[PDB]
Amino acid sequence: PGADAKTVQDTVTQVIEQNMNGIDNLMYMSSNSDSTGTVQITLTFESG
Amino acid sequence: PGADAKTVQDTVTQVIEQNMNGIDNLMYMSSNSDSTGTVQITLTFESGTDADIAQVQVQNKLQLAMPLLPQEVQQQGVSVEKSSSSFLMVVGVINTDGTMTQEDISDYVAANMKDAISRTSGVGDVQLFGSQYAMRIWMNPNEL
Amino acid sequence: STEEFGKILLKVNQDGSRVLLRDVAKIELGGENYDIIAEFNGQPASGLGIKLATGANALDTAAAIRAELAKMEPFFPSGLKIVYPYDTTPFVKISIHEVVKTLVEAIILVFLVMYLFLQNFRATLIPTIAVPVVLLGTFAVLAAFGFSINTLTMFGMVLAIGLLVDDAIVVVENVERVMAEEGLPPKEATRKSMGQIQGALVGIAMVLSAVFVPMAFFGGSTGAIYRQFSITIVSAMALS
Amino acid sequence: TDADIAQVQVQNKLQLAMPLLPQEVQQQGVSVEKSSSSFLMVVGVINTDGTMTQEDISDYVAANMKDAISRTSGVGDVQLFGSQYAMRIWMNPNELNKFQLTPVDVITAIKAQNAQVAAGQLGGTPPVKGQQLNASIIAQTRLTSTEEFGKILLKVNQDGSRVLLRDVAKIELGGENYDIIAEFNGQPASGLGIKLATGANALDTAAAIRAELAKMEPFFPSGLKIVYPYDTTPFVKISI
Amino acid sequence: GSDLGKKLLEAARAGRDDEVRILMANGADVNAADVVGWTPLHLAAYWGHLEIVEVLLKNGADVNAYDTLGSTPLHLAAHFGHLEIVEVLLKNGADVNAKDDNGITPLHLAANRGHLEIVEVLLKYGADVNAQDKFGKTAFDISINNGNEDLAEILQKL
Amino acid sequence: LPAGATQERTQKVLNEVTHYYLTKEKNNVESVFAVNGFGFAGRGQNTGIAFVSLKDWADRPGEENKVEAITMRATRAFSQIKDAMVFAFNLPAIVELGTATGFDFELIDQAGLGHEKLTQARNQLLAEAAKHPDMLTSVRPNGLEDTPQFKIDIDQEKAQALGVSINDINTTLGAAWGGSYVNDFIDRGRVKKVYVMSEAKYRMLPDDIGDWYVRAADGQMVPFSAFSSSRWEYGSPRLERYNGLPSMEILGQAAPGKSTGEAMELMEQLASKLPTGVGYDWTGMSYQERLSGNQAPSLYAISLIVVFLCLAALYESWSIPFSVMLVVPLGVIGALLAATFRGLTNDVYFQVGLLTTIGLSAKNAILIVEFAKDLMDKEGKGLIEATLDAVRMRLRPILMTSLAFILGVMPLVISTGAGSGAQNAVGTGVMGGMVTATVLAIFFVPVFFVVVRRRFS
Amino acid sequence: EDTPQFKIDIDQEKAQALGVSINDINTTLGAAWGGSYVNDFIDRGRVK
Numbered sequence A: 001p002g003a004d005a006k007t008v009q010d011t012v013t014q015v016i017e018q019n020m021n022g023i024d025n026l027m028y029m030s031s032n033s034d035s036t037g038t039v040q041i042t043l044t045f046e047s048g
Numbered sequence B: 001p002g003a004d005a006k007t008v009q010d011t012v013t014q015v016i017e018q019n020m021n022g023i024d025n026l027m028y029m030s031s032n033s034d035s036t037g038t039v040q041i042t043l044t045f046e047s048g049t050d051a052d053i054a055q056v057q058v059q060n061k062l063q064l065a066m067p068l069l070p071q072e073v074q075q076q077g078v079s080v081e082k083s084s085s086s087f088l089m090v091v092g093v094i095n096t097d098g099t100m101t102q103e104d105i106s107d108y109v110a111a112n113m114k115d116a117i118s119r120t121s122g123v124g125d126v127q128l129f130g131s132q133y134a135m136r137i138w139m140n141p142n143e144l
Numbered sequence C: 001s002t003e004e005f006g007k008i009l010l011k012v013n014q015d016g017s018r019v020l021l022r023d024v025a026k027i028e029l030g031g032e033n034y035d036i037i038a039e040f041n042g043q044p045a046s047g048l049g050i051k052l053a054t055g056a057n058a059l060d061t062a063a064a065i066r067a068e069l070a071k072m073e074p075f076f077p078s079g080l081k082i083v084y085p086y087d088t089t090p091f092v093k094i095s096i097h098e099v100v101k102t103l104v105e106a107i108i109l110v111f112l113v114m115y116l117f118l119q120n121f122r123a124t125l126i127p128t129i130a131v132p133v134v135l136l137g138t139f140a141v142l143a144a145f146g147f148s149i150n151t152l153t154m155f156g157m158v159l160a161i162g163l164l165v166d167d168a169i170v171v172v173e174n175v176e177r178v179m180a181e182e183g184l185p186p187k188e189a190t191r192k193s194m195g196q197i198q199g200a201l202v203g204i205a206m207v208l209s210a211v212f213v214p215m216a217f218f219g220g221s222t223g224a225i226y227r228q229f230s231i232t233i234v235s236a237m238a239l240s
Numbered sequence D: 001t002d003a004d005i006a007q008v009q010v011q012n013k014l015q016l017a018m019p020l021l022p023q024e025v026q027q028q029g030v031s032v033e034k035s036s037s038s039f040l041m042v043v044g045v046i047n048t049d050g051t052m053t054q055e056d057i058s059d060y061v062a063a064n065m066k067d068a069i070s071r072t073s074g075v076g077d078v079q080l081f082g083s084q085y086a087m088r089i090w091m092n093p094n095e096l097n098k099f100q101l102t103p104v105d106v107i108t109a110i111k112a113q114n115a116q117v118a119a120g121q122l123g124g125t126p127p128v129k130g131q132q133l134n135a136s137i138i139a140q141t142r143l144t145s146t147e148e149f150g151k152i153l154l155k156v157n158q159d160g161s162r163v164l165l166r167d168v169a170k171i172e173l174g175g176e177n178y179d180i181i182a183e184f185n186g187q188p189a190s191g192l193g194i195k196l197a198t199g200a201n202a203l204d205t206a207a208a209i210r211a212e213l214a215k216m217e218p219f220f221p222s223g224l225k226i227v228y229p230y231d232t233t234p235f236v237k238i239s240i
Numbered sequence E: 001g002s003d004l005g006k007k008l009l010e011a012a013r014a015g016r017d018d019e020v021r022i023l024m025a026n027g028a029d030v031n032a033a034d035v036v037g038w039t040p041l042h043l044a045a046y047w048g049h050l051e052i053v054e055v056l057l058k059n060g061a062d063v064n065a066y067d068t069l070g071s072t073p074l075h076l077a078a079h080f081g082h083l084e085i086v087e088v089l090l091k092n093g094a095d096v097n098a099k100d101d102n103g104i105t106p107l108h109l110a111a112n113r114g115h116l117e118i119v120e121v122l123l124k125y126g127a128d129v130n131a132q133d134k135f136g137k138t139a140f141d142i143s144i145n146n147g148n149e150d151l152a153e154i155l156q157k158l
Numbered sequence F: 001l002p003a004g005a006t007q008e009r010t011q012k013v014l015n016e017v018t019h020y021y022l023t024k025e026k027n028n029v030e031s032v033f034a035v036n037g038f039g040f041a042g043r044g045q046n047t048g049i050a051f052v053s054l055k056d057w058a059d060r061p062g063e064e065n066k067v068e069a070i071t072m073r074a075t076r077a078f079s080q081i082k083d084a085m086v087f088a089f090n091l092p093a094i095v096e097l098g099t100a101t102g103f104d105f106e107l108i109d110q111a112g113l114g115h116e117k118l119t120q121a122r123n124q125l126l127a128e129a130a131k132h133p134d135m136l137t138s139v140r141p142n143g144l145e146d147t148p149q150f151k152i153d154i155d156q157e158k159a160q161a162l163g164v165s166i167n168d169i170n171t172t173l174g175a176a177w178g179g180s181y182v183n184d185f186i187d188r189g190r191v192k193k194v195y196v197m198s199e200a201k202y203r204m205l206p207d208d209i210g211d212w213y214v215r216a217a218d219g220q221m222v223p224f225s226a227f228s229s230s231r232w233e234y235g236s237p238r239l240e241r242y243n244g245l246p247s248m249e250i251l252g253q254a255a256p257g258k259s260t261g262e263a264m265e266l267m268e269q270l271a272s273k274l275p276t277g278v279g280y281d282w283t284g285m286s287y288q289e290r291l292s293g294n295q296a297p298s299l300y301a302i303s304l305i306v307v308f309l310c311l312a313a314l315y316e317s318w319s320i321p322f323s324v325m326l327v328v329p330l331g332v333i334g335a336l337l338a339a340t341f342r343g344l345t346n347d348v349y350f351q352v353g354l355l356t357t358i359g360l361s362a363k364n365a366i367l368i369v370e371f372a373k374d375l376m377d378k379e380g381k382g383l384i385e386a387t388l389d390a391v392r393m394r395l396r397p398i399l400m401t402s403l404a405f406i407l408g409v410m411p412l413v414i415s416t417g418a419g420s421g422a423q424n425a426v427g428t429g430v431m432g433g434m435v436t437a438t439v440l441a442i443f444f445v446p447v448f449f450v451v452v453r454r455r456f457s
Numbered sequence G: 001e002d003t004p005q006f007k008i009d010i011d012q013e014k015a016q017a018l019g020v021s022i023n024d025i026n027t028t029l030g031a032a033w034g035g036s037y038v039n040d041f042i043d044r045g046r047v048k
């Protein structure tokens, strides 16, 4: 709450993302950090 | 931080142990509480148990115990991990010209190396031997 | 920054002067903990403890890690060097190679022995074809069971090689004998020869299955190791 | 439905609610369970030599038996028919008002004087050069007895006298609650109401419970005895 | 810090009576001390090993040895309820009114943990009942604050 | 190092250990990774590990320059060291699995006895185990002993009298001496911790306690000396628990000549005469044996039955199978000879080698018996005639496989390079087993077949 | 079924007049009549 996109990215998004390593069947990871404090990190997996 | 073995045992270890209930296929549980402020509880499961299910069940029961632990322990965080202690390799990082301390090297590796190794193909997990920087305020009681 | 933390205001005195945090404390970027002192031949050190991902190729990963470390070389500060005190990949590269050498050498030895006794290039080819077919096929079954190429499964094949070699030799030899003793042509000789042994070979498969299959049903850590050899040998022997 | 996943998904959502809940609810411990509604068995506990009360037995069960049964695989939920002891401070309002004190003062002093302090070390890292001593500092530790809680100093009067906690409250070991009270054939008892975890085998879990109870029996106090007043499993074994 | 001094410290702690006997024969330093200033006698007094306390005093151990904070073997024995060692130490000339750096005596410690027998023994060997610590507290003050009925009756002999 | 020893003291030993490996083992050792502050038995200032990395296997020729040899020299060299238990040792084949030799015992507080009475019970158990060197060796705790610690008592009355809050006292003590994680900050776009702690020089010794001050309600600064008292006591630097109860782990192994099952059976007996409220349990490697112990015979009991039944169906005879089944020892003897000759062990590679040696010898016997039986059944030949004609026909294929397969495993026996331990264990048990299985079966199988057929007319 | 219950209204004005905190009122009422879990202690080695 109240945090800008960059502050949110540095304190939340990257911190979470650098722990999303060595998950099974991970194809790609996308994410975004915005001016309302919101982080969304979507991880898409191999078919099946 | 700064806790003796008994303080750790009686404020952290016992409280977590009392909440390790309703978890499937547990053979046995063991723990150590030591004078460097550390606790390690290991829960060993039956062979054939799904390790991910075993881990999430432990993790979930811990989360519900977190409000009972001390402020300082909640703040530091309690890590639940699978104990697959088998390194592929250890990459050492050293300083030959005497310009960097171990703390300086560890921070360089944290900031400019670790993440890229974590994202490398086939890499399951990466451990920093040391910590990234911390802002240290070394107090003087005479001046205070 | 350390400068900003130094400028933190703790109090303002009556006379006017300001007590800042740098007045009552030293301030620096340091470590989180100071319990561990790590050195490498006397010099300060840190490092990365890297683990292999589930189902990943250990040799590919090691090459890939070294490739990424190479891209980082140009940007290091003065004095910084990468070193490799522990690495299982050199050992794993040797273990697999020595097993592959043994399996190929075993096939040439059978060629040399087959020619020494039977004395024609034609017959000595038949095991040289049949043994690779069975070896390759075993890997397909290992893949189907979710097994990996590893020290245990590889030596499982080295231990199996005697059973594979024997199936090839027994079949060919027994045709060469039936041709020599009775004088029948290759096609009729093979029908008679296989008539003498086909019932036995099926019985041998069942008996050998009963020797090896129970080894898969051991419990715990010991039983996980025994199961690697069991599935590899039972698969190789069954294809043979 | 996979109950392991049902519990995970439910608990993922509960975790979003947790911070919004009152502090007091979080501190009692919220629990997510996957069990049958009906009791698998009741493990009763009595004292055949009448040496322990209903309250003593229940505490013994809670402190020495319940947790290990709760950790056993297949045990979905364990209901204690009774209460574990807690340190009960039974406040007196007349004596509280006599010394100008309230329940808020009692609570603050118990937090201040029944505390487990992390105090650091003599010669701790990072040390000065030439340090010879390294030793943990032990400051306040948790209180262990009614006597120690009794001598908690609430305040010191103007004339120098001391208001201890025992001067404004009766202090005793007693149930967390006093709601559940059980009897077996008229005599004092406690016990464990055990519910089968979703989809687990009743007979295997019962066997595991009876095995875990056998490990406890040798270290009971004098007279304490397990009784079996309700068990759904024996009919299954007898009917089959 | 001799070679046998360290082994006597460890042996006196562990209560290995036979190893102490041999170390007494070989001349192990009875006045050897930890970083914290504890002799073998301190260690034997703490962990309650009676035979070793007696053996060390026979071999010229300092009965009034003091650690880095002023505590003696009598402080340790009286505090941890080792009646036999308290009597033996007092018999071999232990300072019954010994004060540590806090002003705490063996009487204060014995009183604080309700060791009734020890408090009487200390009194019999001339313990000062009115001895105050750094906070002005007598052994009597400790007994009423702890709510010890029986102990308060004994110490009320001003 | 001993208990209470400092980081610097440990560093001096690690520097000495590193100096040895780079001087005395200069031709073997590539590097020494010294880690002051960590030991497997329990981390602390008084412990450390040096991970020694060697040069390539090509640059370390002969048995003298292997890990076995370098280990022994280093351990012998480091027996001199000024009060420090220092010793080198090789890693186990599977580091994931642990060392895995002997037993893993847990001594358990079952009735709220407490740390001190559990220590006494543990010492009682260890002293009793020491009186059976014939059964038990290296019976030791896998944990730390009690150490001196500085007990400080905050006086509540004097703190309330001077108007000093207990929170200010305990925060001043803990933050300075122990450190305190306050909050985070952002160093070059990365979130990182902020710690406040005392500068090293003001948190070293008991006299430094009195140099710390706390502000009272009235405004005056009060030193810790004004409202505290202190003393030395003993306490644990590593408290262990097992299944929720206080515990003490005890490692050990069976003595030379004895099995682990015997050693376990003794430790249980010695435990049953420990004080009231002291129980025990088996963990790790010992738990898995205690549960899955009766499998090895029970599985191969079925194996033997299925083998018999399969041969019975093949030959159409309840008796003839025995002629094949009697071959089993003929391979096993040579494997045991070749292993015992070279000083190798009864390991998994050897054991799987036995099963392959047995199976191939069984296969040879099956075909000898099959040929003999068909000659009797179809061509109407006599017992001895059919047996002699059978073994004649099967001599060549038996000798060919054996010649090839013995020569195939020949390099694995002589191998001394990288991964040679496993290769040796595979090779020797196969070679020696094949030599006896080949030589004996050709003469013994006809004996087995003839004896069986005569016995069962 | 519904049952009699003792409804009590804290007068906010009168409380503010006397200088009595509403937190001290509610803690007093709740702790005394309902009970209050303050913190933990150790009974024969076990956290309770």
Ligand SMILES: CCCCCCCCCCCCCCCCCCCC(=O)O[C@H](COC(=O)CCCCCCCCCCCCCC)COP(=O)(O)OCCN
Binding pocket: F304, F305, F308, F318, F319, F456, F457
């Ligand atoms: C514990 C859980 C339970 C597990 C279950 C285990 C089951 C294991 C399977 C065992 C099956 C064995 C069955 C054999 C039964 C004997 C049948 C033989 C009949 C017989 O006497 O043969 C005669 C010819 O003699 C001959 O030529 C000799 C043939 C007989 C040899 C006898 C030795 C049998 C060996 C089997 C035990 C060992 C197995 C393990 C290695 C003529 O026949 P007839 O029918 O005319 O006679 C009737 C006369 N009026």
Ligand SMILES: CC(=O)O[C@H]1C[C@@]2(C)[C@@H](C[C@@H](O)[C@H]3[C@@]4(C)CC[C@@H](O)[C@@H](C)[C@@H]4CC[C@@]32C)/C1=C(\CCC=C(C)C)C(=O)O
Binding pocket: C059, C092, C093, C096, C097, C100, C101, C104
């Ligand atoms: C002749 C020889 O030396 O073996 C070489 C040759 C080798 C057996 C190779 C491993 C593997 O590709 C082999 C397969 C079956 C791979 C799949 C197919 O495409 C085959 C057509 C191919 C033929 C032989 C080959 C190409 C070798 C290896 C192993 C390489 C691996 C490591 C870890 C060093 C080896 O060098 O030992």
Ligand SMILES: CCCCCCCCCCCCO[C@@H]1O[C@H](CO)[C@@H](O[C@H]2O[C@H](CO)[C@@H](O)[C@H](O)[C@H]2O)[C@H](O)[C@H]1O
Binding pocket: C057, C059, C060, C063, C093, C096, C100, C103, C104, C132, C135, C136, C149
């Ligand atoms: C006659 C037939 C007998 C059957 C023989 C069976 C062969 C079995 C051997 C193992 C097969 C796989 O072996 C394959 O080797 C190559 C070597 O180029 C590896 O390749 C990897 O290691 C090499 C060597 O360090 C790296 O340089 C390379 O970047 C990396 O990709 C593959 O990761 C592995 O998949």
Ligand SMILES: CCCCCCCCCCCCO[C@@H]1O[C@H](CO)[C@@H](O[C@H]2O[C@H](CO)[C@@H](O)[C@H](O)[C@H]2O)[C@H](O)[C@H]1O
Binding pocket: C195, C198, C199, C200, C202, C203, C206, F309, F310, F311, F313, F314, F315
């Ligand atoms: C539950 C499933 C597992 C049960 C275990 C089964 C084990 C059996 C091992 C394989 C035995 C094969 O069975 C065996 O086959 C061969 C031929 O191949 C038969 O041998 C016969 O074949 C044909 C049959 O028409 C005849 O013309 C010929 O004269 C003769 O040689 C034997 O009569 C039979 O005993």
Ligand SMILES: CCCCCCCCCCCC
Binding pocket: C202, C205, C206, C209, C238
């Ligand atoms: C009918 C003849 C072919 C029978 C197949 C024999 C191979 C069985 C392999 C068993 C592996 C478990």
Ligand SMILES: CCCCCCCCCC
Binding pocket: C206, C209, C210, C213, C214, C217, F302, F303, F306
């Ligand atoms: C061909 C079947 C071999 C028998 C294997 C034994 C299985 C045991 C399972 C309990």
